[PDB]
Structure formats: structure tokens, C-alpha cells
Amino acid sequence: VRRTATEMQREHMEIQQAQTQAQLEFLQRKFSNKALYSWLRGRLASIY
Amino acid sequence: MQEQALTELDAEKKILEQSRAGAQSRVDSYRALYDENVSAEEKRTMDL
């Protein structure tokens, strides 16, 4: 029983890993990502 | 995972119940020994 509970802890940790991957995917696909603000910063810095 | 963590306790109870049954069998055996102090034949030996 303790082993089938540790396997469930392992699947829980795997679902956490998949969710961290989903959050990274979201931060990289979302519009207002680091790339957008870098472009706007460089562009506005030239204008300024 | 909480339900697994909680059936693990129903397993610990089974472990402890086997311990209880073993110790109760030992008490039952030694009580019989200590109660039948000397056999009917050990007294026969002393009379002999």
C-alpha cells in the first residue's frame, strides 16, 4: 500500500512537471512576453 | 493521495492486529501451562 501511494506521489510530481511546462509555454507564447518588451524598449530608446 | 495515505492506516491496523493475536495466543498458552501447575503424572512421579 505504501508503494502504491509513492507511485501516486510520483504521478503527482509528474503532473506538476507537466504544469510547470505549461506555464513556461504560456509565458513564451503570450503576447506581452520578454521579446515584445525588448523590441519596444529598443525602439523607444532609439526614438528617445 | 490522501485516500491512499488513509488506507495505509487500515494496513497498519492489520499489522498491529496480527501482533495482538500473536501475543494473545502466547498468553493463552502460558496461562494454561501456569494453571495446570504439575500434570496429573508429575504428581504420580512424586508419589512414586
Say which amino acid occupies A6: T
Cα(A14)–Cα(A16) distance, rounded to whole angstroms? 5
Whether residue B1 and residue A4 make contact (CB cut-off 8 A), yes or no, is: no
In units of Å, what resolution does this entry have? 3.2
Task: Check if A9 contacts B (Cβ < 8 Å).
Answer: yes
Candidates B1, B2, B6, B12, partner chain A, best to mutate (most A CBs within 10 A): B1
Helix/strand/coil (H, E, C) string of chain B?
CHHHHHHHHHHHHHHHHHHHHHHHHHHHHHHHHHHCCCCHHHHHHHHC
Q: Is A4 on the interface with B (CB under 8 A)?
A: yes
Q: How was this structure determined?
A: cryo-EM
